[PDB]
Amino acid sequence: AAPALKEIFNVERLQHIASEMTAVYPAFDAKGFLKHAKAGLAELSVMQRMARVSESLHAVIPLDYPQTLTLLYALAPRLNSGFVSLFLPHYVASYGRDDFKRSMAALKYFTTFGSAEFAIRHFLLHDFQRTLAVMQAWSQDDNEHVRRLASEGSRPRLPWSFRLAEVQADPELCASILDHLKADSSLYVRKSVANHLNDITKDHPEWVLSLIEGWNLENPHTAWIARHALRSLIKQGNTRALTLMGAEVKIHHLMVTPAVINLGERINLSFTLESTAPAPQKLVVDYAIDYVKSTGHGAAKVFKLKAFSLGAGAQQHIRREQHIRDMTTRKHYPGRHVVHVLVNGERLGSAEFELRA
Template sequence: MAGESTERAPALKEIFNRERLAHIARETAGVWPAFDRKRFMKLATEGPDDLGIMQRMRLVATSLHETFPEDFAKAVPILEKLAPRIGHAFTAISLSEYVALYGQQHFDRSLDALKLLTRFGSSEFAIRHFLVADFERTIFVMRGWADDDNEHVRRLASEGSRPRLPWSFQLKNLIADPSPTGPILDALKADPSLYVRKSVANHLNDIGKDHPDMLVERVSNWERSDKHTAWIVRHALRTLIKKGDPLALALIGTTGRAEVKVLDFSVDPKKINLGDRITTRAKLVSASKTAQRLVVDYAVHYAKKNGLSRKVFKLKEIDLAPKATVDLAISQTVRDFTTRKHNAGFHRVELLVNGAVLAESGFDLRIGDSRTR
């Protein structure tokens, strides 16, 4: 339902197109005149067309390695001089990938390089290789990064140590026991940078997927009068809030089980084609004698070939006065995007208030020549 345009995936995949590779080659020659631009271009463009974005990023790193000095100590200064000239953050991640692939035997130099390179293209993927190879040593360095003056370095401390970082492999030891990253999160719990705060919230949300009690206990001990900390806590608890976890709901100030009546809940139109727009509406009236803080969400049961897949979306947080009535609505286009492909069939939609399902509706989706049931 809600999502990104299907056109974004090809555009993302084409970040490493021939023009950008030629730019990398020119800039590399600019900082290291001995660079073999022709050989690099041949190596970096010889991969199959169906390579994904991360595979293409790695191909750039391996192609640079084939044309760089064999001595890692001589190659790293080239990467560090090249980084500010790349001019594109995701492209610059290939430089950190180089360090992850070829710097394992040069721990101190490699981590110094990742700390610098992350300012131009995040080293979040690269640092995970060092966490796997030498966890205690790496996490010790990352705890120091949490106090750095640069927001990119502070974010790396949190993002690189996320147990379930998207687009990367999971850190199984941190999924089993997230406590080693506690000092990092505590150091960043009131960070002035939104860029850092988003990472901290996502890191905590990762923890909550496996250890909800640990997440709630950690953030409940934080001083939430600080606006930055309060923001992190709210976003860190989002998955638990959608599940109706009573402790998580209490931490953001909700009033427990909602005392409301649903006067109307509908999804229109009832039958649509892929690419059409739907509107979900709800009308609630308070049945309480006191004001209520309510979290209103909705869940879609997506039709799948082997059943249904439920996903919860945020609708609105409201303060509802005694006996008051509120009308809510949200519109969106139903279309395929990178992380979700739709199937024809009936899609049940639930209204959730403070985590409890209070009403149901739905819509029939038709795709191509398929017939909805």
């Protein structure tokens, strides 16, 4: 069992920060800084501690914003950890809102030592159009860290940050940023593009599908981004997504018994596949349940049935029992559960069962 993550900002590390700060700034009020930062340290969460380091430095350094930035630039390469150095972008977000230009410059430099993904989002919150333009430039920088910030900082649903409602509502705003990055060599950037697109599929699935259906997947970097961008839709058995990742059959007697169950009971899916081809076919056969979720909407999950060869004009009966019970990773909600049968990524039929209260 690992130590809680707030212990990254423990007193040892505060002392490390004050030591390095004194090396960069001999007149540094190290004692005042440690006193400020330790007050109530125990009851502070990990992100509260990152902020405290920034506030404690600001409270004891008697220099102005540019002069402090000079010391902070020298401090950055001396910190052990990229996580620890989140307080440097945080410092910009706290104290750089009167000097936009210098702040952008400072974020662009600080992000290479850790990440300005959290700090840029305050600027996107309260100064969106100006900040978005900076990022569009950052998406064409030579530094993969800067390019990555362009993608990561503007995500609709960044973990450990508030959602960007403006971005979440309109995927056209950040579209050109992602377009400039859709063939990036950097794995670090490519993850960010994909995770950003994944976020978009939570609210504009059809928009993402069309974008990627316009892409040249001959390019391996682009292909990588597409697979991981579409990963949620894939797991839902989205037909268009499955086509993007890569059958002469008919189906008989598709059914789900019983038609109504209580939680804890079993269902049984069955059908017969028949080939209409003159030669054997490699088939991948899956099914998806539109599970009823908290909202009362459906969210589809795909299970594997069978991957096999069906001879010319042949038949294969398929049967699967599933135990419908609440588990650690899935809670069930009552209502109508549609069940689709997929053959080679195409929906071939649907049945349903009802799960009651």
